UniProtKB/Swiss-Prot annotation, chain C:
It comes from Rattus norvegicus (Rat). The modification Phosphothreonine is found at residue 134. It comes from the Eukaryota. The chain holds residues 99 to 294 of 838 of the full protein. This is V-type proton ATPase 116 kDa subunit a 1. Subunit of the V0 complex of vacuolar(H+)-ATPase (V-ATPase), a multisubunit enzyme composed of a peripheral complex (V1) that hydrolyzes ATP and a membrane integral complex (V0) that translocates protons. V-ATPase is responsible for the acidification of various organelles, such as lysosomes, endosomes, the trans-Golgi network, and secretory granules, including synaptic vesicles. In certain cell types, can be exported to the plasma membrane, where it is involved in the acidification of the extracellular environment. Required for assembly and activity of the vacuolar ATPase. Belongs to the V-ATPase 116 kDa subunit family. It is found in: Cytoplasmic vesicle, Clathrin-coated vesicle membrane; Cytoplasmic vesicle, Secretory vesicle, Synaptic vesicle membrane; Melanosome. The lineage of its organism: Eukaryota, Metazoa, Chordata, Craniata, Vertebrata.
From Swiss-Prot, chain D:
This is V-type proton ATPase subunit E 1. It comes from Rattus norvegicus. The lineage of its organism: Eukaryota, Metazoa, Chordata, Craniata, Vertebrata. V-ATPase is a heteromultimeric enzyme made up of two complexes: the ATP-hydrolytic V1 complex and the proton translocation V0 complex. The V1 complex consists of three catalytic AB heterodimers that form a heterohexamer, three peripheral stalks each consisting of EG heterodimers, one central rotor including subunits D and F, and the regulatory subunits C and H. The proton translocation complex V0 consists of the proton transport subunit a, a ring of proteolipid subunits c9c'', rotary subunit d, subunits e and f, and the accessory subunits ATP6AP1/Ac45 and ATP6AP2/PRR. Subunit of the V1 complex of vacuolar(H+)-ATPase (V-ATPase), a multisubunit enzyme composed of a peripheral complex (V1) that hydrolyzes ATP and a membrane integral complex (V0) that translocates protons. V-ATPase is responsible for acidifying and maintaining the pH of intracellular compartments and in some cell types, is targeted to the plasma membrane, where it is responsible for acidifying the extracellular environment. The gene is Atp6v1e1. The chain holds residues 4 to 57 of 226 of the full protein. Expressed in brain (at protein level). It comes from the Eukaryota.
From Swiss-Prot, chain E:
It comes from the Eukaryota. This is V-type proton ATPase subunit C 1. The chain holds residues 2 to 164 of 382 of the full protein. It is found in: Cytoplasmic vesicle, Secretory vesicle, Synaptic vesicle membrane; Cytoplasmic vesicle, Clathrin-coated vesicle membrane. The modification N-acetylthreonine is found at residue 1. Expressed in brain (at protein level).
Length: 57, 103, 178, 54, 163
């Protein structure tokens, strides 16, 4: 009892820590996804203008 | 020419100030109630108009009824001053959230 | 020269004795706090080792009811407190009396409640000291305080013996000096 | 009593969990913002360099 | 009038608490007139800022009470010619302040519910501060005009040399 409450409190604290860690991992993964999507768009445009340069040549 | 203007301005501004005051009363009610009762929220607060010299009986009945809804194992009896610190209790603590409108 | 020595040595002895007694009492209070916090953290400590805020201290017995009421009335239903009597009553850090004491541990949510409880205890003339955050830290600092307590006890005994010896030497001839 | 202990346990448990959820939602919103701004920054810089070159 | 707002923490449902509080109380005796507050569901936040708010709304209730009573005093002064029925003249809406409060309903237009509690508190605070400053300035100007009139009256009064 006097220790059961403390056990419950610590378990809740660990649950909160795990949830915020999961949110942080999601943030990092989405940051990497944003980087990848930007790079893919860059490559698409780069090939577009490469083809345009070839046509001009 | 100015009394009519100033009088009208006071009349309009009294409504706004009173509305804001009641809004702050509501805000304090909700904040204190959510603190006293853990989430989720259930704060169907009751606004009671005291009758003629019925304050003592009404308060006693309310305390008896709220002894269950609130922990009777603390407060109620008495408490010493703790003025030093960031804040000190300013009003009496009752077995519920209690607030006054003094129109 | 003789009397200057016999006075300066005694004054330094008294000052050091007072300061070291204060330190010894504070450290023994810390030791008891650590031991009881370890006892409280023994329901089921499956993990070996941050939102929750933690404090612990000691209160004078029979103030537990008023203190618990004040806590539950200020930090309304949002702070936890556990208490345990300290058998073999101890001597006050400054007030200087043998009084029963209760070692207590308080859990709180955030910074505002931390400040609330800290000020409440300070007004209740308790004492807090730091506390460990992990069992490893608890063991380390408990061993450290225990060793320091034993060292301080040895130094206290030695200095008291020194005071007794010098005062005996003084009394041997104080009348002739006078 | 035991009922008081249980009520407090519920109260702090609920409030700590809700604080965690609020932090998680704030993190998710700021993460979407970071996604958008990083897309904009990287795309703009690489596009500027490619414009210069071409 | 004196009105008491009581939390009545639900009791697992709106009925189980409100019915006993109001209908049962009235049936037992007409000790007090019962009413429902029907507070809107605001956006609850973290407990650190929530306790901060429990202090800020401890201060601001008193401050706004002072401002409203200052407005009442200014009305009683400027309207001293027809000060009768000051409450009726001051009623924010409805017929009287008592009616308004007993039928109080939060104004989402006045305050955005979706906003945070601190944001709503600041929204109220800015308005009340502006109201206090405007009351001070305008009432001071009107009092200065009235004082000029009183000085003219005093000059008319008194002996020929004194006047």
């Amino acid at each position: 009892s006097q220790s059961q409450g403390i056990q419950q409190l610590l378990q809740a604290e660990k649950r909160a820590a795990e949830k915020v860690a999961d949110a942080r991992k999601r943030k990092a993964r989405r940051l990497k996804q944003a980087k990848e999507e930007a790079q893919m768009e860059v490559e698409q445009y780069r090939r577009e203008r490469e083809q345009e340069f070839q046509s001009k040549q | 020419k100015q009394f009519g203007p100033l009088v009208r301005w006071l009349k309009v501004n009294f409504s706004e100030a009173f509305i804001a005051w009641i809004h702050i009363k509501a805000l304090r009610v909700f904040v204190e109630s959510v603190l006293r009762y853990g989430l989720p929220v259930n704060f169907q607060a009751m606004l009671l108009q005291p009758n003629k010299k019925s304050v003592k009986k009404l308060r006693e009945v309310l305390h008896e009824l709220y002894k269950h809804l609130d922990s009777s194992a603390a407060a109620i009896i008495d408490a010493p001053m703790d003025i030093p610190g960031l804040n000190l209790s300013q009003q009496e603590y009752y077995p519920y959230v209690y607030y006054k409108i003094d129109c | 020269a003789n009397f200057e020595k016999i006075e300066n040595e005694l004054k330094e002895i008294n000052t050091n004795q007072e300061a070291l007694k204060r330190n010894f009492l504070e450290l023994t209070e810390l030791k008891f706090i650590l031991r009881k916090t370890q006892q409280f953290f023994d329901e089921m400590a499956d993990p070996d080792l941050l939102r929750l805020g933690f404090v612990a201290g000691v209160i004078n017995r029979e103030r537990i009811p008023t203190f618990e009421r004040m806590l539950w009335r200020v930090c309304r239903g949002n702070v936890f407190l556990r208490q345990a009597e300290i058998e073999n009553p101890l001597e006050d850090p400054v007030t200087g009396d043998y009084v029963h004491k209760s070692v207590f541990i308080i859990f709180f949510q955030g910074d505002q409640l931390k400040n609330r409880v800290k000020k409440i205890c300070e007004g209740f003339r308790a004492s807090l000291y730091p506390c460990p955050e992990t069992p490893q830290e608890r063991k380390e600092m408990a061993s450290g305080v225990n060793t320091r307590i034993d060292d301080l006890q040895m130094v206290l005994n030695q200095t008291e013996d020194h005071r007794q010896r010098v005062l005996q030497a003084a009394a041997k001839n104080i009348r002739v000096w006078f | 009593s035991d009922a008081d202990v249980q009520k407090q346990i519920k109260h702090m448990m609920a409030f700590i969990e809700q604080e965690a959820n609020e932090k998680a939602e704030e993190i998710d919103a700021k993460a979407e913002e970071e996604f958008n701004i990083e897309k904009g920054r990287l795309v703009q810089t690489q596009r500027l360099k490619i414009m210069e070159y071409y | 009038t004196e009105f008491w707002l009581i939390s009545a923490p639900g009791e697992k449902t709106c009925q189980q608490t409100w019915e006993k509080l109001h209908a049962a109380t009235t049936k037992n005796n007409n000790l007090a007139v019962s009413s429902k507050f029907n507070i809107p569901d605001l956006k609850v936040g973290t407990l650190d800022v929530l306790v901060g708010l429990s202090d800020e709304l401890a201060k601001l209730d008193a401050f706004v009470e002072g401002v409203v009573k200052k407005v009442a005093q200014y009305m009683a002064d400027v309207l001293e010619d027809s000060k009768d029925k000051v409450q009726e003249n001051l009623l924010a809406s409805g017929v009287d302040l008592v009616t308004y409060i007993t039928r109080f309903q939060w104004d989402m237009a006045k305050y955005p519910i979706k906003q945070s509690l601190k944001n709503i508190s600041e929204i109220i605070a800015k308005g009340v501060t502006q109201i206090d400053n405007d009351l001070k300035s305008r009432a001071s100007a009107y009092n200065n005009l009235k004082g000029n009139l009183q000085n003219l009256e005093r000059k008319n009064a008194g002996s020929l040399l004194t006047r």
